[PDB]
Amino acid sequence: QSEPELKLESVVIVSRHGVRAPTKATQLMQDVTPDAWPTWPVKLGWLTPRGGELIAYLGHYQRQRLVADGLLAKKGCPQSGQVAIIADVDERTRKTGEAFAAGLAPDCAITVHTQTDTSSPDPLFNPLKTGVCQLDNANVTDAILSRAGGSIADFTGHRQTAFRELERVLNFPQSNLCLKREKQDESCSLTQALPSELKVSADNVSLTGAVSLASMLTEIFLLQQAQGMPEPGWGRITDSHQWNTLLSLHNAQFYLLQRTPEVARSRATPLLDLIKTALTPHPPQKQAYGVTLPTSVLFIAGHDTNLANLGGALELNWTLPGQPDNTPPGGELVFERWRRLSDNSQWIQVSLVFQTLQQMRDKTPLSLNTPPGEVKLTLAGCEERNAQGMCSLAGFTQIVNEARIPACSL
Numbered sequence: 001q002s003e004p005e006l007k008l009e010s011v012v013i014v015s016r017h018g019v020r021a022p023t024k025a026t027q028l029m030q031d032v033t034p035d036a037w038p039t040w041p042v043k044l045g046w047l048t049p050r051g052g053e054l055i056a057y058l059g060h061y062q063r064q065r066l067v068a069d070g071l072l073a074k075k076g077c078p079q080s081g082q083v084a085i086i087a088d089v090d091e092r093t094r095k096t097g098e099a100f101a102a103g104l105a106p107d108c109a110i111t112v113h114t115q116t117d118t119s120s121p122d123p124l125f126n127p128l129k130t131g132v133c134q135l136d137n138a139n140v141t142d143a144i145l146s147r148a149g150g151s152i153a154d155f156t157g158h159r160q161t162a163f164r165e166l167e168r169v170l171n172f173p174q175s176n177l178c179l180k181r182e183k184q185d186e187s188c189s190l191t192q193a194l195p196s197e198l199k200v201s202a203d204n205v206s207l208t209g210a211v212s213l214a215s216m217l218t219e220i221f222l223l224q225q226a227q228g229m230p231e232p233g234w235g236r237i238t239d240s241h242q243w244n245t246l247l248s249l250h251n252a253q254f255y256l257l258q259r260t261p262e263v264a265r266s267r268a269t270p271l272l273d274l275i276k277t278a279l280t281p282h283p284p285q286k287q288a289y290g291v292t293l294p295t296s297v298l299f300i301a302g303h304d305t306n307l308a309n310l311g312g313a314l315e316l317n318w319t320l321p322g323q324p325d326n327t328p329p330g331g332e333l334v335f336e337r338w339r340r341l342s343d344n345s346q347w348i349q350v351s352l353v354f355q356t357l358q359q360m361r362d363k364t365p366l367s368l369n370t371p372p373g374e375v376k377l378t379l380a381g382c383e384e385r386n387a388q389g390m391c392s393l394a395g396f397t398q399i400v401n402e403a404r405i406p407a408c409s410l
């Protein structure tokens, strides 16, 4: 029988937390719609039990997947120091680490390690926020505007179709913001009512106005859908074309703020370093958290921003069939190191594993027979590839070494 020419020796998964309740409930959010936003079963920004289940499903699937690839045993708890789970200090990331462990190795109680001080932010997930390093204001301002086509105005102008679709779902025309409009000489418009400005600081970048509101609102509609709520968007979202149109406003903000190299490289350095060191063969040592690397499987519970920063820094681009959000809840950036049996050469493969919006909505259990969506990624700047199109260890290491910003390493 034909035998595999490659052998999986290491897996590093950077995952976004699972489905959570919206992070905010502001006055603006209520003024752009005459309707009442549905309530959630958990606290704002917290993981919902359903979100935990969905993550557990992926954990269940990865276990079956890894067993078939021979990296994890089919029975029993993984051997000590074989599986490592790290998570940002947030409740939602911590719980995602627990949901994955429970799904990967039920009743095994794998430890979810986090930074010791959980009341302070973890630089691993954003070195800017803690001051490890800073953004070049002028340079970042120029790069974002450049990618925006010169101005945020031209940027939004090109997405008015998506913006009017959002207004339709919000019944924005009968909203307070619209009704108490002073300049009613003109038609109600989200981009007009809320001009979007680019704000760049040493430790942060943001978009004010309709761009960020739209990006948040559309994500909330997706969350309702994934959460299984009766009628996401008050029942005004009836087809896949509408889902994509709405979410495009979300992916668009991430394109500008999280994918832009001038922000991405810096923001992803700590993770880039952890990933490379975890994938590079070495004797069981550390990098932080009281966890030994290298190992066999490393699961990192983070955020969508991290997935986008890594994509931008590694020059990885993707679209997920059946999933309008490019960095969906539970979404996994999978890094694997395979060894070519023929000559013992090392190769790295990158994928994006995720549950389609329907698999979330229907809470469909995952397995080898019913796997989650998956897209094999190609490192744009990698020259030395193998038959399967994987990048060589050396090639990948070169890519990581040039993308990272040393001043931002931990």
Ligand SMILES: [Hg+2]
Binding pocket: 112, 113, 114, 289, 290, 291
């Ligand atoms: Hg720990």
Ligand SMILES: [Hg+2]
Binding pocket: 277, 282, 283, 284, 285, 286, 287, 293, 294
């Ligand atoms: Hg190490």
Ligand SMILES: [Hg+2]
Binding pocket: 010, 277, 278, 279, 293, 294, 295, 296, 297, 298
């Ligand atoms: Hg490792």
Ligand SMILES: [Hg+2]
Binding pocket: 219, 304, 325, 327, 328, 329
């Ligand atoms: Hg998102």
